[PDB]
Swiss-Prot record:
Assembly information from the UniProt record: Heterotetramer upon binding of the ligand. The heterotetramer is composed of an ephrin dimer and a receptor dimer. Oligomerization is probably required to induce biological responses. Interacts (via PDZ-binding motif) with GRIP1 and PICK1 (via PDZ domain).
Compartment list: Cell membrane
Post-translational modification: Phosphorylated.
Tissue expression pattern: Widely expressed.
Family: Belongs to the protein kinase superfamily. Tyr protein kinase family. Ephrin receptor subfamily.
Residue ranges constituting the Eph LBD domain according to the UniProt record: 1-159
The protein's name: Ephrin type-A receptor 7
Record function comment: Receptor tyrosine kinase which binds promiscuously GPI-anchored ephrin-A family ligands residing on adjacent cells, leading to contact-dependent bidirectional signaling into neighboring cells. The signaling pathway downstream of the receptor is referred to as forward signaling while the signaling pathway downstream of the ephrin ligand is referred to as reverse signaling. Among GPI-anchored ephrin-A ligands, EFNA5 is a cognate/functional ligand for EPHA7 and their interaction regulates brain development modulating cell-cell adhesion and repulsion.
Organism: Homo sapiens (Human)
Amino acid sequence: EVLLLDSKAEWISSPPNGWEEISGLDENYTPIRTYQVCQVMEPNQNNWLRTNWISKGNAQRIFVELKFTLRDCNSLPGVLGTCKETFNLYYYETDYDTGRNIRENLYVKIDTIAADESFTKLNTEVREIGPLSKKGFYLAFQDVGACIALVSVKVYYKK
């Protein structure tokens, strides 16, 4: 109802070689900005992606909507080992935009994010956070060895 962030209306990667921005166009020529990572054959993945600072405005409870694809580890060509089928959603509250650094220890886990069941394509997961005590916040996404395309992020509140 009131949008705080709409990724369809560049974010920080740590390391920069992990989550990577990959762009395209809609059928009606709207930019598509995705962030993708698929380091499924390398051990000990800790790939962080952080949004811009988000002002909470007059929000109390806040909703975060993620749209993403996520490959079944069974479909990836003989990868084995430490392949994952989830990623982690994090946030950190600040009163002001503090700059481009991701100090990972400051981030608080919201939830593990999983794809829809496939053993029976584009997944949509919503989490509700807040009320927040600070004026704003960053969202972050931690990949630990999955094959993910993060297609859109929307942050909004109601009434």
